[PDB]
Amino acid sequence: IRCIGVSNRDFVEGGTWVDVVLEHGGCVTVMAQDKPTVDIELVTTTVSNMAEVRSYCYEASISDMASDSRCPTQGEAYLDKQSDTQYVCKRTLVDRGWGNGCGLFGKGSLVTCAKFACSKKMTGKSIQPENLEYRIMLSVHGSQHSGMIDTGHETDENRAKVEITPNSPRAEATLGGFGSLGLDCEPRTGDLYYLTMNNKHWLVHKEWFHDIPLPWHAGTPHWNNKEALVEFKDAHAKRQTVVVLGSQEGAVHTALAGALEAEMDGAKGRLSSGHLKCRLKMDKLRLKGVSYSLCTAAFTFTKIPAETLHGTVTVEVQYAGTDGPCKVPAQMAVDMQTLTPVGRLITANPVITESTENSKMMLELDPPFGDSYIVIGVGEKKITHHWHRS
Amino acid sequence: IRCIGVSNRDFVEGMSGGTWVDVVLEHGGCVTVMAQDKPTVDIELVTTTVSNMAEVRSYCYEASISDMASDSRCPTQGEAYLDKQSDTQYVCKRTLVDRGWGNGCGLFGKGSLVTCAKFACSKKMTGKSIQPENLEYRIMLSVHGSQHSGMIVNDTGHETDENRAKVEITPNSPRAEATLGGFGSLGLDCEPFSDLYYLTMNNKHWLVHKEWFHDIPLPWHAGAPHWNNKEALVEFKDAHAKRQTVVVLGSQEGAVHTALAGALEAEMDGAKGRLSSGHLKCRLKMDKLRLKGVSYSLCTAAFTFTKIPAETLHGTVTVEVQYAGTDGPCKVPAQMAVDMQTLTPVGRLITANPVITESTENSKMMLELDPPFGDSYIVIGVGEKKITHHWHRS
Ligand SMILES: *[C@@H]1O[C@H](CO[C@@H]2O[C@@H](C)[C@@H](O)[C@@H](O)[C@@H]2O)[C@@H](O[C@@H]2O[C@H](CO)[C@@H](O[C@@H]3O[C@H](CO)[C@@H](O)[C@H](O[C@H]4O[C@H](CO)[C@@H](O)[C@H](O)[C@@H]4O)[C@@H]3O)[C@H](O)[C@H]2NC(C)=O)[C@H](O)[C@H]1NC(C)=O
Numbered sequence: 001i002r003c004i005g006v007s008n009r010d011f012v013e014g015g016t017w018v019d020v021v022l023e024h025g026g027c028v029t030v031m032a033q034d035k036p037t038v039d040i041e042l043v044t045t046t047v048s049n050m051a052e053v054r055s056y057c058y059e060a061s062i063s064d065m066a067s068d069s070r071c072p073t074q075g076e077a078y079l080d081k082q083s084d085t086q087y088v089c090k091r092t093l094v095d096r097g098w099g100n101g102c103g104l105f106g107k108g109s110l111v112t113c114a115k116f117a118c119s120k121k122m123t124g125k126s127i128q129p130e131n132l133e134y135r136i137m138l139s140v141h142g143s144q145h146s147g148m149i150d151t152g153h154e155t156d157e158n159r160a161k162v163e164i165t166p167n168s169p170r171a172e173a174t175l176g177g178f179g180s181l182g183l184d185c186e187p188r189t190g191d192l193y194y195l196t197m198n199n200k201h202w203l204v205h206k207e208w209f210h211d212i213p214l215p216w217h218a219g220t221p222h223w224n225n226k227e228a229l230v231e232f233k234d235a236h237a238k239r240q241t242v243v244v245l246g247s248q249e250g251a252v253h254t255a256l257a258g259a260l261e262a263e264m265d266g267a268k269g270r271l272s273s274g275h276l277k278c279r280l281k282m283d284k285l286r287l288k289g290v291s292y293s294l295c296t297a298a299f300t301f302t303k304i305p306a307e308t309l310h311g312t313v314t315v316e317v318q319y320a321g322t323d324g325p326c327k328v329p330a331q332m333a334v335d336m337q338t339l340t341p342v343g344r345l346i347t348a349n350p351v352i353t354e355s356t357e358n359s360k361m362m363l364e365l366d367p368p369f370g371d372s373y374i375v376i377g378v379g380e381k382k383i384t385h386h387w388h389r390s
Numbered sequence: 391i392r393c394i395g396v397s398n399r400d401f402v403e404g405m406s407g408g409t410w411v412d413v414v415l416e417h418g419g420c421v422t423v424m425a426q427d428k429p430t431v432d433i434e435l436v437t438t439t440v441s442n443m444a445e446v447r448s449y450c451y452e453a454s455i456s457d458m459a460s461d462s463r464c465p466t467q468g469e470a471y472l473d474k475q476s477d478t479q480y481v482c483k484r485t486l487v488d489r490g491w492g493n494g495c496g497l498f499g500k501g502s503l504v505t506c507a508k509f510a511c512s513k514k515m516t517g518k519s520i521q522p523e524n525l526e527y528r529i530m531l532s533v534h535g536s537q538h539s540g541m542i543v544n545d546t547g548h549e550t551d552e553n554r555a556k557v558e559i560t561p562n563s564p565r566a567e568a569t570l571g572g573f574g575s576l577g578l579d580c581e582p583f584s585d586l587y588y589l590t591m592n593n594k595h596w597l598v599h600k601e602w603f604h605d606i607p608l609p610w611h612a613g614a615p616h617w618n619n620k621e622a623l624v625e626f627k628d629a630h631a632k633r634q635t636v637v638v639l640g641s642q643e644g645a646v647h648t649a650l651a652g653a654l655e656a657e658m659d660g661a662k663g664r665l666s667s668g669h670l671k672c673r674l675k676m677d678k679l680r681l682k683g684v685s686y687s688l689c690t691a692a693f694t695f696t697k698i699p700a701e702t703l704h705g706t707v708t709v710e711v712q713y714a715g716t717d718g719p720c721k722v723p724a725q726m727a728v729d730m731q732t733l734t735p736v737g738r739l740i741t742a743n744p745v746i747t748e749s750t751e752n753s754k755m756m757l758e759l760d761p762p763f764g765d766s767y768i769v770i771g772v773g774e775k776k777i778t779h780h781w782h783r784s
């Protein structure tokens with residue numbers, strides 16, 4: 001019943017195997033003759049062990065600015081901080097003469113150094129294909145009431161959590177009295193890096209990531225290409241001004257436009273977009289209560305029939321009888337004399353499971369276009385509801 | 391002497407005596423002007439400033455969001471409403487979300503969702519207007535003759551020093567007269583934004599085009615606030631049935647800075663803007679310019695080289711000498727010679743009438759010469775105690 005309400009909802013009809021395409025945000029209702037209806041959804045795709053590859057500085061700070069200068073023919077300018085790896089330096093040639101303290105007129109050497117510090121960095125992580133995990137949720141059309149309409153699936157036969165990984169593509173899901181469903185999925189269909197910048201994530205190309213013009217370190221940190229976040233403007237003969245370029249967060253963000261965005265789930269990456277092809281084994285799937293007799297007593301609508309986005313109807317009824325467990329007489333009819341079924345049920349084998357009076361139950365129907373009637377129960381006491389589709 | 395050391399240095403000579411000389415003053419450039427029976431003067435356009443810049447528009451480049459809230463309705467329960475959706479400090483997004491019996495709705499279909507966030511600017515950039523009349527050109531004047539080495543780069547005390555002068559030229563006042571104490575005076579008649587704006591962002595300044603400035607895709611407000619186009623820095627992302635995520639785009643300082651590459655960069659000088667690049671055509675009046683110290687006698691005592699004679703980029707030779715005598719103020723005997731017996735002058739001086747201005751012993755003085763090609767001798771002083779320096783020009 002988990003697909004009921006989902007916009008991107010598909011319907012597959014089957015018989016030993018049914019092929020199903022599971023997409024993120026999507027849900028598949030699977031039907032097969034003499035088998036219960038099952039809702040299947042790819043709920044999350046996660047990657048578990050992302051190793052840091054390279055981080056890039058997008059906001060830097062500079063301090064301890066100093067200079068050294070030489071006169072023409074006096075050789076290269078020298079600062080002791082030009083061997084400190086935390087410093088960024090620029091070596092230039094400046095016009096010198098009697099006006100600024102040289103015996104000769106010509107180009108002298110100038111060196112300017114600044115202590116570079118990163119304020120904010122973005123980290124790129126590796127994705128190993130084996131480290132992908134697909135979580136699939138299963139939910140049978142088991143005649144649940146609205147008070148049964150995600151947690152506690154291990155103790156509820158109608159629900160199951162399946163874990164699919166590239167190494168373990170096959171799984172078997174027990175559904176209590178419904179028997180079991182087998183799943184054999186192909187990940188494959190679902191050059192990249194996992195990028196994080198200020199609690200924002202993306203899946204970026206390898207070539208693009210490596211050619212980012214910002215200071216970087218591999219895997220206290222040593223920044224390679226600090227020159228990218230600084231600017232050395234010539235100011236005087238014995239001094240050169242050095243200034244930080246300012247935060248590149250916005251520029252990087254707009255460069256990432258169109259690129260695939262991702263999310264986090266603790267220390268694990270979550271793929272918002274994914275596709276998974278599964279082959280479902282139907283041999284062990286079984287309808288509960290084929291031995292049940294048709295319910296003989298009166299039904300009453302608890303909830304007003306409501307149309308889903310796909311034009312199907314959800315119906316909730318209450319049952320006055322004590323002859324439970326029994327089959328729910330349910331159909332749609334165009335004429336109330338003949339009562340030949342029109343449309344079809346989505347819920348295979350709708351049942352009142354309890355032997356108690358005034359018990360609730362929910363079912364889903366696929367009405368024909370135009371006017372028809374929802375019909376619950378048998379004989380004189382049968383309840384009717386006018387319906388219109390499109 | 392202020393042109394000595396300048397790479398972009400020009401030399402202009404005046405006619406037989408002469409009354410006027412035309413000069414082109416560029417930023418970073420310097421002009422040495424010479425004329426017969428007149429002292430040599432160095433003239434430089436030192437700064438161009440703009441005085442009364444009115445703010446036109448400010449753009450937000452770093453924003454912050456707070457007070458994030460949502461409202462969601464079931465299908466047929468109408469439109470989602472927050473009271474902040476009409477508050478001008480807020481940025482909102484109205485969307486449709488999947489609803490049903492699992493979401494508390496009696497019906498299955500799309501329900502209205504509204505998300506709103508209070509927008510605040512952290513950092514903004516301001517664009518200012520430049521009125522053509524509000525331009526000011528500062529010209530520095532330096533006379534050759536008295537000054538030693540230490541005065542090539544100084545600009546402290548020109549108000550009390552006859553050798554130096556500050557001239558202020560504006561579009562409304564293009565003519566100025568500069569008094570040079572005993573050197574008389576020099577007259578200046580110079581010839582000095584319709585599509586340009588002055589931009590300021592985090593103590594960094596530039597001159598930007600009008601069309602470029604107005605088409606900047608960032609939140610803005612006119613004058614010196616209500617932010618128009620807050621959406622430029624706010625991203626809405628759908629997250630759930632009753633909630634949607636809203637996030638700030640992050641600082642655009644870097645992106646704006648790289649977009650400004652190639653564009654003309656500017657500077658500030660207090661509350662006034664400073665144009666790093668400029669050009670000024672001046673006509674100089676030479677009639678009132680006079681050679682101070684023609685009455686001076688030739689220095690009789692010994693000279694000694696303080697600085698070794700050095701060739702400038704243009705092949706001139708700067709000489710700095712110290713003077714042992716107390717008979718100051720006096721004329722420095724200075725020339726170049728090819729032979730030390732005959733001593734007939736060769737080349738010429740750049741510094742017209744070099745002098746020892748002080749009556750004190752061991753005073754310094756600097757002069758500039760224009761040597762002939764090949765070998766020559768720099769001769770300073772008279773008689774037996776005269777000092778010589780061999781020189782070669784190629
Ligand atoms: C920029 O220019 C200023 C001033 O301009 C110039 O001042 C003269 C030096 C001269 O060249 C002028 O043509 C011109 O206006 C410079 O400031 C001067 O700096 C000097 C040296 O630092 C000072 O000289 C001192 O003057 C005192 C006068 O009473 C005297 O006590 C000092 O002692 C000297 O004499 C005794 C022996 O008796 C002994 O201690 C030493 O022999 C010592 O030199 C000394 O002569 C001037 O006072 C300063 N003048 C002003 C107005 O500030 C400035 O240094 C220069 N800056 C740069 C960057 O070039």
Ligand code: NA
Nearest residue numbers: 548551552554
């Ligand atoms: Na003066």
